[PDB]
Amino acid sequence: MSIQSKSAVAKGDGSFTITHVTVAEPKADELLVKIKAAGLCHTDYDSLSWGKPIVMGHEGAGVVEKVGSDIKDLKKGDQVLLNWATPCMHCFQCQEGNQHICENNSPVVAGHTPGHAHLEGSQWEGKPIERSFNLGTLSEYALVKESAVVKIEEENLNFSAASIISCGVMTGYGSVVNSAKLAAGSSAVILGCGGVGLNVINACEISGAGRIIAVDINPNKLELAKQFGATDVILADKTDVGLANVAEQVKEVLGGRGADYAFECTAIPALGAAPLAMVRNAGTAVQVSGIEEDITIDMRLFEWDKIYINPLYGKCRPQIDFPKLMQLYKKGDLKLDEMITKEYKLDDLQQALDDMLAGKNAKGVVVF
Amino acid sequence: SIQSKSAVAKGDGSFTITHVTVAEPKADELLVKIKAAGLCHTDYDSLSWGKPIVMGHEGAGVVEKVGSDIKDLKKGDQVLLNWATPCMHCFQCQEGNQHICENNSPVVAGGHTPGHAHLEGSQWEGKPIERSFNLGTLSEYALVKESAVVKIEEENLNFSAASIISCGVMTGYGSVVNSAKLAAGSSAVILGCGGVGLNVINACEISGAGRIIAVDINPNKLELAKQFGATDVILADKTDVGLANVAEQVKEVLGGRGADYAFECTAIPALGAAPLAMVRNAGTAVQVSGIEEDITIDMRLFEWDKIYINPLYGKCRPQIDFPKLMQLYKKGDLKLDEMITKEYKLDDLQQALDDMLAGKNAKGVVVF
Amino acid sequence: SIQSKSAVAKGDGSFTITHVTVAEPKADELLVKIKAAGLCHTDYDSLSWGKPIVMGHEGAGVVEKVGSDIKDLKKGDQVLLNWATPCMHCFQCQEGNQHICENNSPVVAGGNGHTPGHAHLEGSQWEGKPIERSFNLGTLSEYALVKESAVVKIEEENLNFSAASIISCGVMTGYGSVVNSAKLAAGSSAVILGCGGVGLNVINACEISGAGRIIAVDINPNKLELAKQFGATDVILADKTDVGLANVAEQVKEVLGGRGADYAFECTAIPALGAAPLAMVRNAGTAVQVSGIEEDITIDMRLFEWDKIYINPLYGKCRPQIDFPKLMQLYKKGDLKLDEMITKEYKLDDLQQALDDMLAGKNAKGVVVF
Amino acid sequence: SMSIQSKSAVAKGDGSFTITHVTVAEPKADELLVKIKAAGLCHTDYDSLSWGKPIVMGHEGAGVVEKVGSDIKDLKKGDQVLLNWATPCMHCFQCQEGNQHICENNSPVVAGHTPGHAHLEGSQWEGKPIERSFNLGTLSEYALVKESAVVKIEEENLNFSAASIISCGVMTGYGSVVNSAKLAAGSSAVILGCGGVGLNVINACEISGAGRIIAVDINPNKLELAKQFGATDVILADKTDVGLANVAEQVKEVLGGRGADYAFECTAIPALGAAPLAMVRNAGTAVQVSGIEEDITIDMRLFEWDKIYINPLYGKCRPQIDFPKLMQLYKKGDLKLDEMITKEYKLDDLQQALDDMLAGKNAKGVVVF
Ligand SMILES: NC(=O)c1ccc[n+]([C@@H]2O[C@H](COP(=O)([O-])OP(=O)(O)OC[C@H]3O[C@@H](n4cnc5c(N)ncnc54)[C@H](O)[C@@H]3O)[C@@H](O)[C@H]2O)c1
Numbered sequence A: 001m002s003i004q005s006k007s008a009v010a011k012g013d014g015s016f017t018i019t020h021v022t023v024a025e026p027k028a029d030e031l032l033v034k035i036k037a038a039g040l041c042h043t044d045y046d047s048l049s050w051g052k053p054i055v056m057g058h059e060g061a062g063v064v065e066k067v068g069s070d071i072k073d074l075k076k077g078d079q080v081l082l083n084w085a086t087p088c089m090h091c092f093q094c095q096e097g098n099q100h101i102c103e104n105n106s107p108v109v110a111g112h113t114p115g116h117a118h119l120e121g122s123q124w125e126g127k128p129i130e131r132s133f134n135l136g137t138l139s140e141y142a143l144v145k146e147s148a149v150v151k152i153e154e155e156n157l158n159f160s161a162a163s164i165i166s167c168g169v170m171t172g173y174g175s176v177v178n179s180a181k182l183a184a185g186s187s188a189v190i191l192g193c194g195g196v197g198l199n200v201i202n203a204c205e206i207s208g209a210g211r212i213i214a215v216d217i218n219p220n221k222l223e224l225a226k227q228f229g230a231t232d233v234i235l236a237d238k239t240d241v242g243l244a245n246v247a248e249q250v251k252e253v254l255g256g257r258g259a260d261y262a263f264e265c266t267a268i269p270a271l272g273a274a275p276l277a278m279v280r281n282a283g284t285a286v287q288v289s290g291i292e293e294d295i296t297i298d299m300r301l302f303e304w305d306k307i308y309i310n311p312l313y314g315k316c317r318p319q320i321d322f323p324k325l326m327q328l329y330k331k332g333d334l335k336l337d338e339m340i341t342k343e344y345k346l347d348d349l350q351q352a353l354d355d356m357l358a359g360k361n362a363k364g365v366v367v368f
Numbered sequence B: 001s002i003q004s005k006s007a008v009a010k011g012d013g014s015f016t017i018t019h020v021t022v023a024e025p026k027a028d029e030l031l032v033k034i035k036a037a038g039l040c041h042t043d044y045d046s047l048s049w050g051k052p053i054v055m056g057h058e059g060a061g062v063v064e065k066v067g068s069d070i071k072d073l074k075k076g077d078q079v080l081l082n083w084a085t086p087c088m089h090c091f092q093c094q095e096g097n098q099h100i101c102e103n104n105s106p107v108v109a110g111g112h113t114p115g116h117a118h119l120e121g122s123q124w125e126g127k128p129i130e131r132s133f134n135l136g137t138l139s140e141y142a143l144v145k146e147s148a149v150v151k152i153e154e155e156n157l158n159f160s161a162a163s164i165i166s167c168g169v170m171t172g173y174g175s176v177v178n179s180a181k182l183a184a185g186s187s188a189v190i191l192g193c194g195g196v197g198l199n200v201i202n203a204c205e206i207s208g209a210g211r212i213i214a215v216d217i218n219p220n221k222l223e224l225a226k227q228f229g230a231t232d233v234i235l236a237d238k239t240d241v242g243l244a245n246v247a248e249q250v251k252e253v254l255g256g257r258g259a260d261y262a263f264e265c266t267a268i269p270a271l272g273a274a275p276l277a278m279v280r281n282a283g284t285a286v287q288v289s290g291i292e293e294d295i296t297i298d299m300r301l302f303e304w305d306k307i308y309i310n311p312l313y314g315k316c317r318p319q320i321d322f323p324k325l326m327q328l329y330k331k332g333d334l335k336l337d338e339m340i341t342k343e344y345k346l347d348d349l350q351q352a353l354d355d356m357l358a359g360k361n362a363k364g365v366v367v368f
Numbered sequence C: 001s002i003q004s005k006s007a008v009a010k011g012d013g014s015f016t017i018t019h020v021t022v023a024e025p026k027a028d029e030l031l032v033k034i035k036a037a038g039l040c041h042t043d044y045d046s047l048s049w050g051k052p053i054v055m056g057h058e059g060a061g062v063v064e065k066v067g068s069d070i071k072d073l074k075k076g077d078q079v080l081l082n083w084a085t086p087c088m089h090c091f092q093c094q095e096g097n098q099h100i101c102e103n104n105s106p107v108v109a110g111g112n113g114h115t116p117g118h119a120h121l122e123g124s125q126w127e128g129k130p131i132e133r134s135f136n137l138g139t140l141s142e143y144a145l146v147k148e149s150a151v152v153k154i155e156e157e158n159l160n161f162s163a164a165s166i167i168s169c170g171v172m173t174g175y176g177s178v179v180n181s182a183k184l185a186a187g188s189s190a191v192i193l194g195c196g197g198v199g200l201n202v203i204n205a206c207e208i209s210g211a212g213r214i215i216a217v218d219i220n221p222n223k224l225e226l227a228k229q230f231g232a233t234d235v236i237l238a239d240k241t242d243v244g245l246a247n248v249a250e251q252v253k254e255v256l257g258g259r260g261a262d263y264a265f266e267c268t269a270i271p272a273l274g275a276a277p278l279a280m281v282r283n284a285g286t287a288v289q290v291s292g293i294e295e296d297i298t299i300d301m302r303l304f305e306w307d308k309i310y311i312n313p314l315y316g317k318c319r320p321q322i323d324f325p326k327l328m329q330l331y332k333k334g335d336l337k338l339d340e341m342i343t344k345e346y347k348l349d350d351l352q353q354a355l356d357d358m359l360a361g362k363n364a365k366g367v368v369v370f
Numbered sequence D: 001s002m003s004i005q006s007k008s009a010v011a012k013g014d015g016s017f018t019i020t021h022v023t024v025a026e027p028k029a030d031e032l033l034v035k036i037k038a039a040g041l042c043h044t045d046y047d048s049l050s051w052g053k054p055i056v057m058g059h060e061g062a063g064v065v066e067k068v069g070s071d072i073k074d075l076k077k078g079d080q081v082l083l084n085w086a087t088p089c090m091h092c093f094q095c096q097e098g099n100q101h102i103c104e105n106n107s108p109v110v111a112g113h114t115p116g117h118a119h120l121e122g123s124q125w126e127g128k129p130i131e132r133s134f135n136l137g138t139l140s141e142y143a144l145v146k147e148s149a150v151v152k153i154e155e156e157n158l159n160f161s162a163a164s165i166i167s168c169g170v171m172t173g174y175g176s177v178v179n180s181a182k183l184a185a186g187s188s189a190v191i192l193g194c195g196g197v198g199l200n201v202i203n204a205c206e207i208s209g210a211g212r213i214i215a216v217d218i219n220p221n222k223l224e225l226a227k228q229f230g231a232t233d234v235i236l237a238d239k240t241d242v243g244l245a246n247v248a249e250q251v252k253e254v255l256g257g258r259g260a261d262y263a264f265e266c267t268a269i270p271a272l273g274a275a276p277l278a279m280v281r282n283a284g285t286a287v288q289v290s291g292i293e294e295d296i297t298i299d300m301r302l303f304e305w306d307k308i309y310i311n312p313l314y315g316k317c318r319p320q321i322d323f324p325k326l327m328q329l330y331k332k333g334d335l336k337l338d339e340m341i342t343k344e345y346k347l348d349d350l351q352q353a354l355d356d357m358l359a360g361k362n363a364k365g366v367v368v369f
């Protein structure tokens, strides 16, 4: 039979629908993956306003349903994590180790790319539909290129836990460990304790930060922050321009000097320079949200030797980073189980989105 | 109490050649007979700090008189001046960031410091007068702390060449070597080919950059850039907002990809984000001018993984870096002699300042 | 001139509990009332230096008396001691390498004699002769005369001075070897050869830094059980005959799935194992030799082959004023397990037992408390 | 399709070599046939005489594409190519770390034949497959290689002799300074052994901005060459100086009582493998470039204190990244490739080029076709 996969589709007018997408047999370098769990990221919300129809979802874990003619490393029944780098392995950036900004295949930096499965293989209302971030994980079956999958091998695997590795975990963890290269014993400030920020916090704790200050406008998020390793919390005011008041409090909590590292995770474009306010001179400020607007910045915030970086996807190298995360999860340091606040069914995607936006969840996941 | 002919900036935008009353040195201080004093763009800015100052923060000379506790200097020793005057004991000094010393930096801690000679030691209109950047080199005789000098030992020393080490050379060289850590074989864009920018260019050539693209609005400065290492020149539009036309030309010149490194040192506040437009993803953008204003930034310029840094004084560690610069001068790699465009007597400071702003000099020096 | 009960090594191989005359501090000096002193093998070695020594190079205490120039410290201040006593002005100090200070380091610049990091030689007298203090400190004493560069101020209620006293040497060395020297990255794999005072702190530091696998190796199975306390994920009983631990390297590759570890640390004090961490790591891995070896040894140079970084760091690249307060915070946070490292506390008059227990391998760390 | 009889230098596996013909066959889909224009000589080519198996010698070369396999789309007949012996797979753990030079699948050093080598039946001698040295075999009129072995360049009036030595001597010396040591401008550097590799180490320290560059050799002709490539200081070592201990004292003398920031050992002498440690100050960086596969005796005080010691392979070459950077440094005049070509040889005079190498008469010798 022709595969009819129950899916979430964003129509490109601002709204989404639960519906069915027709999914092909894989070409030679593609796989058919049965999704067991799909995580929800803030960017899925933004993806409703892209102005083109897409199968939604770019966090997901599952099992190989069927393999293309030229795939050797994978077979039906294999457990897999999905990544949206889908890197080409030959371009300049891939050879620098920057698989996450692959010049040919990145859905962000190149985009639909050769990291996307063949376009006609996914059909909605009898027409090809794009797969969000080359994946489209809010769907019973996803068609993906081989470079989208990382094979794992775990008994009694919690697939809801595994599904969030794909974005929130990898981005938050990689921003700490790959980009900032946070040193043990140091002080770290996290601005915004949501899907990404709670993983920055977890990763600061894994990395051995001596002080970890969590900042949010929502008191429920601060309490989650403590679960994942924050040593201090600061409730911000929405009216705190550039979080400048928070910066003075950080200096006071640390004894008169700014933090060694700060991470911005708020999804608020106006707060793009806030991590610079938090750090001492020669500190490291990492802006994780990604901002595509003009904003006004007091350039004094850059003064003096502060490193500022806006990294993509935590500098993800999927076949390298995902097994390292899996090992930290199994060891007990990476707290993926506790991060899954609620599981939902695909029909209740709206309630899951609302619980995310309302600040009720660390991470919500759709389970199939 | 000696009378030293000096350039004093009154706190109104104006200066006057006058006499400053200099006292004998305290136990940890020194009287330096200035042989040559370099001119920095910042000396122009210092006219409009609303306080009387003994101008000048670049200089070389000979030790005139030594205080009680000075053990390794004597009358007659050749010395270079530095304005870091580091305390050697605070957190930043112990980090090796002597240039942002939390106690003595005239920039970071002034706003004053123990890096300044005793305030009574320098007087004008019957009042203590401060010495620019703890130095005040545009003066026949300077009173300074020991941490302000670096002893050198040279035969037939060109004091003019030595005088510009104190700021323009250290800042430009250090921004490349200590702050950006530019790798041999890379591509580099330099925006602004002035006293700092020509030393950034020199330092890219010393460092082994494969392509060095010099950018200025003044054709005379581009011809000078070719002397110091530039392999390519771009004449910019004084009305190219954000230098976006220059970015397209860079990508064109480099074969379709942005540069590995870009350095901004135009003294134009609105160009503070410009080096980001010049570099590829994961490139390094260094903002050398130092901007204290609000400016509007297209935050897309930070996407993705670009390192942006605003270093102070090229991360100068004077007793370490100044001898390395002297060796590079002696070796023929650091082209100090070509940088000295004209030598002025103190009474002609105005003409020196005019030639500075008219773009007629790489460096002008005042000679005594 | 105050009289301080002290452990003096006589040089002949013996030591005695005695009293040592300690002057008031000159202007850059200060008198510390030692609360606790850690013990390690170096103190046994200071019995055979062939000159009378005030023993002890690990300690924590309280300022008793301050010299005329000291401004940072006052009577009653809690202090940790460090044996780097850096000068802050030489090339290495300006490089951030205070632990190898060209002027004051008792290891680098102490060539039989003592350095300017030592308090003035006449400030400590035994039998009418001036007496040298071990590593510029002499902490196995009720009152120690030291330079300001030797102490790091801290402020804690209910401070476990015994825990505090071991930061001075083994903790700094093993933690620093991981964090400052190897700069171990979270998620990686690490092998630790030798699980004594240094090695257990290497293991703790790998755990603190977030290694995904931590393989402990020792010839003493009791030490492997301890290694599990401090965070080891896997343990290997090494065979004392195994030359260069070639069998252990094979087992490491098996445990890890076919490739060497990212990092390996050698803490065995066995000269012939100096190159062993090379055998444990993959190509382009990092091999850290913590022991310090001064003998000629024969090395199969294929072990270096191919991009392995090899380093023999001193004192964990300690910058005392920066690193000791960070360690204190990790202790307060619960991550650095100082309390669990203290196997036994001793009286100064018990020093003979504490050295016997140490040489017998009975302790993780022994501490003298006053 | 035909079977080319390629005149070649073959090491027989008995310690000798011969000039002979090797049969080279049609390239498979991911392979290609290269007409060699020039082949450099590296000290390792002489070590390959002792490997105990027949090999087509040579692992430095530059040439033009003679024929492209079915699936090659980025190269055509006539294209200029530099050869590299990393032949990286691009998918293993090391390749994804950026360490294509120690590829776990394809490296002829760390894996080897490998899938970095062209199909084994494609090169034949005495009726049976013959391995190509370092997956290349450049001392031959035509080489059969994998696509991963070539870097396309385009340059009018290219000097192929200068281009041929990028393949090993230049990349190893340059990369050991810039990729491994990460030598910082203004620092002091000591180079032990001024040969094919050491002279490129010296060039790369000059390119990188070292303030002091101290060349050391037992051969006075090499010290004169070293000055051409940027040495500010030269020291004639004695063959009697165990560990180069007296040289170490003179390095400190020359640097005002202090050890150097960086030292590179390039001597091909196994007993000298620890020598760079004695040249450097505490927290200095010592780079052992030769590669030693023997037991030696090391005074372990040489490691004392924070000295980084490292034995890098092939200058950490990522050939598609590094080789274009080297080509640009050559074109702008900083990398002095032309000046490294001391003498050019016919293939039949390969014996003379090997004696000239071992006698120390050349910077680099190349065979031209
Ligand atoms: N760079 C990347 O590769 C990458 C990857 C994933 C997500 N993102 C981006 O990261 C951002 C955050 O993602 P998320 O899933 O964690 O979203 P989220 O909604 O789960 O978390 C946002 C958090 O920021 C808090 N916050 C809002 N305003 C604040 C303020 N003024 N001060 C302090 N805290 C404030 C919110 O309460 C919330 O807890 C999104 O913009 C998303 O697009 C980037």
Ligand SMILES: NC(=O)c1ccc[n+]([C@@H]2O[C@H](COP(=O)([O-])OP(=O)(O)OC[C@H]3O[C@@H](n4cnc5c(N)ncnc54)[C@H](O)[C@@H]3O)[C@@H](O)[C@H]2O)c1
Residues within 6 Å of the ligand: B040, B041, B042, B167, B168, B171, B191, B192, B193, B194, B195, B196, B197, B215, B216, B217, B218, B221, B236, B237, B238, B265, B266, B267, B268, B271, B288, B289, B290, B311, B312, B313, B314, B356, B357, B359
């Ligand atoms: N970070 C530090 O420690 C430090 C130290 C010294 C100076 N500075 C700062 O560096 C800046 C430059 O100093 P300087 O002495 O080199 O000044 P300068 O006047 O000598 O040179 C500035 C150059 O920028 C050129 N320029 C102006 N507008 C341009 C444009 N739109 N595009 C391209 N080029 C343009 C000018 O033609 C001139 O050549 C000053 O703002 C100064 O305060 C910083």
Ligand SMILES: NC(=O)c1ccc[n+]([C@@H]2O[C@H](COP(=O)([O-])OP(=O)(O)OC[C@H]3O[C@@H](n4cnc5c(N)ncnc54)[C@H](O)[C@@H]3O)[C@@H](O)[C@H]2O)c1
Residues within 6 Å of the ligand: C040, C041, C169, C170, C173, C193, C194, C195, C196, C197, C198, C199, C217, C218, C219, C220, C223, C238, C239, C240, C267, C268, C269, C270, C273, C290, C291, C292, C312, C313, C314, C315, C316
């Ligand atoms: N670099 C520095 O600054 C510094 C500072 C302090 C101590 N050290 C040195 O570190 C070394 C270790 O000191 P320590 O106090 O931990 O000594 P220790 O005796 O307490 O521990 C050494 C451990 O190595 C084990 N071991 C012995 N042989 C072994 C083998 N063949 N294989 C595996 N394990 C073996 C032993 O069982 C013992 O547990 C000493 O040499 C000491 O001199 C160096």
Ligand SMILES: NC(=O)c1ccc[n+]([C@@H]2O[C@H](COP(=O)([O-])OP(=O)(O)OC[C@H]3O[C@@H](n4cnc5c(N)ncnc54)[C@H](O)[C@@H]3O)[C@@H](O)[C@H]2O)c1
Residues within 6 Å of the ligand: D041, D042, D043, D044, D047, D168, D169, D172, D192, D193, D194, D195, D196, D197, D198, D216, D217, D218, D219, D222, D237, D238, D239, D244, D266, D267, D268, D269, D272, D289, D290, D291, D312, D313, D314, D315, D357, D358, D360
């Ligand atoms: N790590 C790698 O990837 C790599 C790559 C190429 C070559 N190599 C190795 O590098 C080494 C050098 O190769 P090469 O082609 O430059 O050889 P070479 O023969 O051209 O040069 C060796 C130099 O060392 C000199 N020398 C000999 N003894 C000396 C001594 N006691 N003191 C000082 N100098 C001495 C010689 O006079 C000669 O100039 C070889 O062992 C070779 O196998 C390694």
Ligand code: NA
Residues within 6 Å of the ligand: A205, A206, A207, A208, C207, C208, C209, C210
């Ligand atoms: Na941890």
Ligand code: NA
Residues within 6 Å of the ligand: B205, B206, B207, B208, D206, D207, D208, D209
């Ligand atoms: Na250069």
Ligand SMILES: [Zn+2]
Residues within 6 Å of the ligand: A041, A042, A043, A044, A058, A167, A168
């Ligand atoms: Zn996402």
Ligand SMILES: [Zn+2]
Residues within 6 Å of the ligand: A087, A088, A089, A090, A091, A092, A093, A094, A101, A102, A103, A104, A105
């Ligand atoms: Zn790519």
Ligand SMILES: [Zn+2]
Residues within 6 Å of the ligand: B040, B041, B042, B043, B057, B167, B168
């Ligand atoms: Zn200036």
Ligand SMILES: [Zn+2]
Residues within 6 Å of the ligand: B086, B087, B088, B089, B090, B091, B092, B093, B098, B100, B101, B102, B103, B104
């Ligand atoms: Zn300071």
Ligand SMILES: [Zn+2]
Residues within 6 Å of the ligand: C039, C040, C041, C042, C057, C058, C169, C170
């Ligand atoms: Zn000890």
Ligand SMILES: [Zn+2]
Residues within 6 Å of the ligand: C086, C087, C088, C089, C090, C091, C092, C093, C098, C100, C101, C102, C103, C104
């Ligand atoms: Zn020192």
Ligand SMILES: [Zn+2]
Residues within 6 Å of the ligand: D042, D043, D044, D045, D059, D168, D169
């Ligand atoms: Zn070679």
Ligand SMILES: [Zn+2]
Residues within 6 Å of the ligand: D088, D089, D090, D091, D092, D093, D094, D095, D100, D103, D104, D105, D106
């Ligand atoms: Zn590979």
